Structure 1
């Protein structure tokens, strides 16, 4: 899992990039060439950067550090949920609340409210309550769960943040910059690669590639976790 094989990325379509007019000079070195008014990310640079990022994330999984997942895009969100559930790491997919980590202390009350609503659902509280009030309370439950559901078990600040579509997720990148916590991101041609510790220059507009990258990251984290268990026994 530490090494990401070359051919599969080409099959996934990572190499495809955005149109020339929206091209960003800073990316330039990563883009080998442009064909038919479409930029092409170079295979070698992305493979090498992905290898480094996989090594770093496996290193964190060895020490049990918690890495956040951000899946805002409609395509990214569902796969992020599935992969994060297996990884055991927190994720947010439907929407990214402004200042989540910077104002996490305020978000503590909302997270606790979600947990206690889940508890009162578990313990059968609905029967005592009226039907209409039970329904409205359950609707508030669902609305809170969609936003905070993944991060509710984080119980802290993530040591590392994994993000896709850096251009759309720029706000979280600013929050991570202010905190100083490492951020690993997939940056497509248009997206700005600044203010990120690790750059993975990959296309994010393709469902198949997004699935490939998230799967690789989750596999690395998982293998780090079993390696951690081996030391305990």
Structure 2
């Protein structure tokens, strides 16, 4: 029962892994996360996340941005502390190298290449009878190159897999569980997201290890 005790202890505490210290609206505005596509590229479900429009362009609400980002980071860190498998997706070729490298650095895995049909739904037939499909998915780019929702959000919502995607003005945050409005296209924003996620998951991991070592001592 002590295992369940340890699993439940972080729950009652809010910001228990201290994720809020990482991000600040200063940093977001510096990295140009507040940007958005034109009104022609605007999306209905993204309306409420738009702070306003200026010069046929869109601007994101940074309070909501920071709220959703705090929630996403807390969720990712809780799942890493629970050893829940994580998987990154970014179909954008502009950052595949960086994403794969940071995935290696974290220990968590990624898939930026072409997504094959029924990779997760028929994963048992593809890989083997027993395979632990990932417990958490994240998206640095929700839409594909030709700009329609990647198959991963759909199949994840199907198989009850949680999703954390950064949504630009073109993206549809309906299926996403923890959508973070932001700038999918800017390299500063990409690097910021990668640094935040790697720091958070590494903190969760090391906290798990030190706590379990303390309990082994006790």
TM-aligned CA deviation for residue 86 of structure 1? 1.0
Alignment partner of 1:157 is 2:120: no
Distance 2:103 2:67 in 1: 24
Task: Name the structure 1 match of 2:13.
Answer: none
Distance of 1:229 and 1:193 partners within structure 2: 34
Q: TM-score, normalised by structure 1?
A: 0.77
Shift of 1:13: 0.7
Equivalent pairs, count: 188
- In structure 2, C-alpha distance between the alignment counterparts of 1:76 and 1:163, rounded to whole Å: 12
Aligned to 1:86: 105
Matches within 5 A, 1:39-50: 39-50=58-69
CA distance in 2, matches of 1:71, 1:188: 13
**Higher RCO (CA 8 Å, separation ≥ 6 residues):** 1
Structural mapping, 1:110-189, within 5 Å = 155-168=131-144, 169-189=149-169
The aligned residue for residue 128 of structure 1 is none
Structure richer in helix, relative to its length: 1
Contact 2:87 2:137 in 1 (8 A): yes
Matched with 1:196 is: 176
Residue 65 (structure 1) aligns with:
84
2:89·2:141 contact (CA, 8 Å) conserved in 1?
no
Cα drift, residue 49 of structure 1: 0.5
Partner of residue 9, structure 2: none
The structure 2 residue matched to 1:30, chosen from 32, 37, 49, is 49
Match of 1:232 among 208, 212, 218: 212
Residue 191 of structure 2, aligned match among 200, 211, 214: 211
Matched, 1:107 2:126: yes
Q: Which residue of 2 aligns with 1:12?
A: 31
Give SS of 1:163's match.
strand
> Unaligned 5+ residue runs, structure 2?
1-17, 214-218
Q: Which runs of 5+ in 1 are unaligned?
A: 110-154
Helix, strand or coil: the match of 1:231?
A: helix
Cα distance in 1, alignment partners of residues 28 and 117 from structure 2:
33
Find 1:2's aligned residue among 12, 19, 23. 19
- How far apart in 2 are the matches of 1:77 and 1:93? 6
TM-superposition CA deviations, 1:130-178 (whole Å, max 9, x none): xxxxxxxxxxxxxxxxxxxxxxxxx521111011221225211111011
